[PDB]
Design a protein around this ligand. Sequence first.
Ligand code: HDD
Ligand code: HEM
Lengths: 726, 726
Amino acid sequence: SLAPEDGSHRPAAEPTPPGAQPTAPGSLKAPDTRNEKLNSLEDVRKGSENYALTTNQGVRIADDQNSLRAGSRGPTLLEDFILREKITHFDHERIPERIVHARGSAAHGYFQPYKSLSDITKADFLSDPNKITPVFVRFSTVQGGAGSADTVRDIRGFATKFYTEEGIFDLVGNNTPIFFIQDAHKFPDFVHAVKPEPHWAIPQGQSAHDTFWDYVSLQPETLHNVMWAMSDRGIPRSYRTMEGFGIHTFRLINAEGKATFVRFHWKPLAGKASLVWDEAQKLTGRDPDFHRRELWEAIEAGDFPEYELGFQLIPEEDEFKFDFDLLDPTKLIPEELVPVQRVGKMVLNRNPDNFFAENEQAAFHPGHIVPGLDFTNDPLLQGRLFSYTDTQISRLGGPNFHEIPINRPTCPYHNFQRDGMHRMGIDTNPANYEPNSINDNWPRETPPGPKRGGFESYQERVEGNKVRERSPSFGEYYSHPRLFWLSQTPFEQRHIVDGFSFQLSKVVRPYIRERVVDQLAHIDLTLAQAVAKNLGIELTDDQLNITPPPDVNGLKKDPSLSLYAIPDGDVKGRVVAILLNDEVRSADLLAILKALKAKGVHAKLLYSRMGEVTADDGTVLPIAATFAGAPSLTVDAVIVPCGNIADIADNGDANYYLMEAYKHLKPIALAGDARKFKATIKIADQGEEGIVEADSADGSFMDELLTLMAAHRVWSRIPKIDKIPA
Amino acid sequence: SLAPEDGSHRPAAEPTPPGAQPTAPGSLKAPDTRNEKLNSLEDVRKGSENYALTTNQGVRIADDQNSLRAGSRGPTLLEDFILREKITHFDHERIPERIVHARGSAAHGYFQPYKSLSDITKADFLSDPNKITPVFVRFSTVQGGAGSADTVRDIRGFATKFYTEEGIFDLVGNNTPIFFIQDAHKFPDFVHAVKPEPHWAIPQGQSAHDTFWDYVSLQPETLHNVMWAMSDRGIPRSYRTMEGFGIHTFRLINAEGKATFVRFHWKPLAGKASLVWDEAQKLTGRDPDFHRRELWEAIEAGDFPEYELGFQLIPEEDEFKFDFDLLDPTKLIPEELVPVQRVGKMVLNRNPDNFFAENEQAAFHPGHIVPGLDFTNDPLLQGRLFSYTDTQISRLGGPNFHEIPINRPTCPYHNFQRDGMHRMGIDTNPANYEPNSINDNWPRETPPGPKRGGFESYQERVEGNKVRERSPSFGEYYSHPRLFWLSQTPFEQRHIVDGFSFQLSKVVRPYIRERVVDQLAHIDLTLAQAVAKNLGIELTDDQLNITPPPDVNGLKKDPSLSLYAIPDGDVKGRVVAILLNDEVRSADLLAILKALKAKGVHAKLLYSRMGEVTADDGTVLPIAATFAGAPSLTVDAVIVPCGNIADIADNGDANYYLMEAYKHLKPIALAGDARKFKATIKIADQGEEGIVEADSADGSFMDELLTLMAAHRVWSRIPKIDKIPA
Ligand code: HDD
Ligand code: HEM
């Protein structure tokens, strides 16, 4: 026995806040959190405690420390089957990563609709508010490999596998409502342009390089999702604080056979929130696993990620009533024109047990639909339907990937398909063909019907010649980028301009910069002029005179496109750093900690070393991390209680902690003599908005701090931060 | 034509300094740089200019922008074979990454020995100083995935494939002279402990987590290579500025059949140099491709990486004469006991054309030896011989991986092996077996001899019973860690203390930190106490009484184990940041650039925006990057010329650039009114060693800067940097 005698090696099987206990496999951390998919995985879950170590053939091993040799300093023998099995399995652990969205973090949960949607769709999982559907959800970046960093600037994937009673439905979406390109035939061109360049394989997890902006400058259909990536949408604070979208128009089909067009949304119940660039980029260094870690720890704390599914619904007769084509995936449907109707709630409430087996091997594919749904002719969706089945043949080793446990349906599946690599199911049917008489034709086809019927495609009329031709209705590139720009707050616009300026600064061929600036001049001249100034480029007279693109169906803004214009802050699950000193005023710390706990806000006690410090009254304070070990990047706010401020006041790390939090627009609260830190951040005696300060942490100090946290960041500080050397 | 009329899309095919031209495929950047292996890849090199776009079957494509559909807003048709081929190939682009050392950067070059080694080895590639052997070299980290960052704390790989006239020899080494474990049977346990933990797949690129330190604490054989890893050897400045080692004792076999034991070394001719931890960790966020980039750009500039191959030779009769076992890969052979004999020079002088084809698919394996070399019974090397062939069957898709162009021998290869997936060679031999009469027994075995003979193993005597047992001679774990600690300078010892402190502070289970501090107390009580203080652990009386391990064969230190104890600086290929203002004093800039060019040191001109600025004499200066875009982390030294200093005197990013460089111990030079920046970094009027200052930048000013850069960093500043908040 090598475990400590006090049992401190094993995390408690109860919800605990981030950092309080080591993290564990979900079934050991939360054994009573159950759903029908999690229970169905029990046939393959493997324990370990009290069992003998064996080969994969069940032979007990006596010595797992040594190879078999001829003498204890002699050569290794070929007859060592125990060594060779163990090193063979090791040698073949890796499988190909996903071509795109290779970097991702996943969790188990459940979905329930708010009311039956039987009037608009016959989909069984939406038919009854008491029908619970298990889900598995994977969030991801796009460009980087599986070992790249989480808080890069990039689009994020948001993929949900619903294990329904009539089939698996995968809703495979991203966190922006459009994509970069119009037709799937260009997807390898676009992805090869954003990915690391082919001669040297640089840069990882970044679009800030010549080939991406060469392609963008030559393909103005990309400019709308480029706008979203350059905004703070491209750097979410967490997977819990971003929107999701299916992007394409799909169809709902009800039992009377009526089709309604639909676009799918997920609303984050934790609100929308993003990092600022300098913080995101620094965080890819200090904690490249920050979003993976944050998701896992929220679930362990009981801060479950929750999202509301909603639908934009357009009747078939209104297909042509907009200035843009509903089938064009570079266009959004403004919520001012078609509101999102709330449909039901998804809660993610359990981590996987093994990341490879459940996350790495999961396969999502937007062609996995169920009766009550159907596709449209969007030409990006149409090509996606080919790709996701094809790519699993190499990634997951063959055509039996639906037998890997995470991908298995929970409902029945039976057919005439046989064999393939890795075949698990042993069919007993005398027949492997239909029609057959030798098994009375079972399993049998099922007519379409209101419930539990066979799939049938909506009989949409097709009329046209066979052409490789883009619809002229798709040939408008600039009005949606402009609607996006005008919908952002002034600070969000500043952040967009800085995103394009930073990215084009890394493009080495200056002509590519110039061509991008020309495209910006076709969107909005204030944007193009501001990015041009940062690049030292002067707009020509012709550029200054480009006429702005039209409004989108009369709109000159839509606030639902902004992260922040409409307040939706939620503090639960956020975290605050508390900078300790060697003799902390304990009454300050009591007040701080209990106010935080009352609103579900976590704290991390930090100091210049690990171990403990003792407060004014003898209270022993356990230290979570050092200043340098858990930097202000990883927290939402900073609080300094009073005490012996001289302990830390000349500590460079403590001072820089506050400078960094201040640059990144985070709320900071200073009690008592911690107000001496006002000189480090240049705060005036009569103080400034976004800095909370009092003689003590009582009265309204914690309410004021918590108000600031619900507004996320102190945007009014932006003009104050440029002077600051941090 | 989409290219600019001025030709500015295409980099000049001549050596250029980093940032002067876009980077390019090696055969286009340096078409006149040749060696026999680079020529031999001409059969598979494919151009592009003036050729038509086709399918893989050679059919010209007319419209590569659209899928085929029934009408221009209609559904995609299954008969679109051009779309499906293009998307199928995309779908199957990825192959499994290497199980370890997945992150690596490679180059072509050549090697030649200084004199014939035929008295000690019959190996053909060491027989003639004028016979050149092409090589391909891959440098790597160990733990992280292929999209992880370069400047992590980790061991580095250094693998060289020599394309000899008598076969491929692969010397597959690392940058420290021992490994973590003794027997290959434990490699999957150690690798699993250092890799991301299996429930959640965190952390990437980092050993600072509970499982790694759990295994270390329970396996004291690991402590010697852990010490190197926690030292600044864990964070090299460049792959050009680290040592390489084959780690194991091998054998050299001469023409008379005599065996000499040998350990292989590479000496960097650019000298030994490493980052400091705060710089290295921030660089993984600001440029996760820093080492891959710096290697490619050194080769494009003509700053070719050069290494000296060296042998430690031990006669067979001296196998047992040290106080450690020569076959134990956790023991090094001190150079004070057995010197490194210089054997030859390797120069890397061309970058690949396609990273996937040449770097990703390259396969190195230490069992690829040639006549005149042989193995020993080192129990770690013996298990490696199984693994590297086995792992390529899945990674590279089958047993014909030697037919992948990068891996092909340049010498003849012929045998009776046939078939396997993606077989390229079409054999015309009537026989596929030997002995045969039908082809007069060709190809034929060849007797061993002095040159061009068949391979025969050295007839080592084997005596012992079939045991799984560790040699008792391997059971000593603390004397080499101690020798290494005592051989470091005082600043290097402080950085090792900081490396263990930072890592163990991230271990959540406190008893594991305690266990590791108890192991440290068995190596050196000063090290153990300094780590313990940072963790708030107090040594017990028993720990304070642990008797220090014995010296290694009487050695108290060996300065060849330190990076810096013996000066070996070389400034050629290093890079300085020059911080511009909008009216640069052109006389300073002239002087600076002339002195840098004389020593082969590059410069990058930086400002607060991109574009150009004009100096006092009218000279237009193009800007490489902004102060934030190319931080002080990416350079060796910072120079600020005079001019209109009020332009940048209050710029936050320029002042921070100097604070960050100062903190990281880099030389800083301030001319004229740029001396106003002394206030930001708190330098007294009288000045300080490591800050160069004068009225103008002249001969003397630059000589002093260049002398500082030859000593790499300003170690004497270390007590001054804790004050500064950066
Ligand atoms: C024609 C090819 C194609 C195109 C046009 C797209 N994808 Fe895709 N996508 C792939 C081909 C692909 C893929 C090669 O099939 C992947 C990689 C590995 C896998 O299983 O599927 C994939 C993976 C992938 C994943 C990760 C699924 C997971 O976590 O495993 C997400 C979230 C998306 N995609 C989302 C999108 C959205 C919202 C798109 C446009 C609206 C889109 N993809 C277009
Ligand atoms: C002994 C110290 C060791 C050193 C210095 C060493 C060095 C290396 C290096 C440098 C590479 C990367 C080669 C490249 O650039 O592609 C590598 C790959 C590998 N190593 Fe070793 N290694 C060591 C021990 C081992 C051991 C003991 C095993 C198994 C017992 C092992 C199994 C592998 C495998 C499976 C790969 C991937 C190779 C491929 O996919 O082509 N390593 N190691």
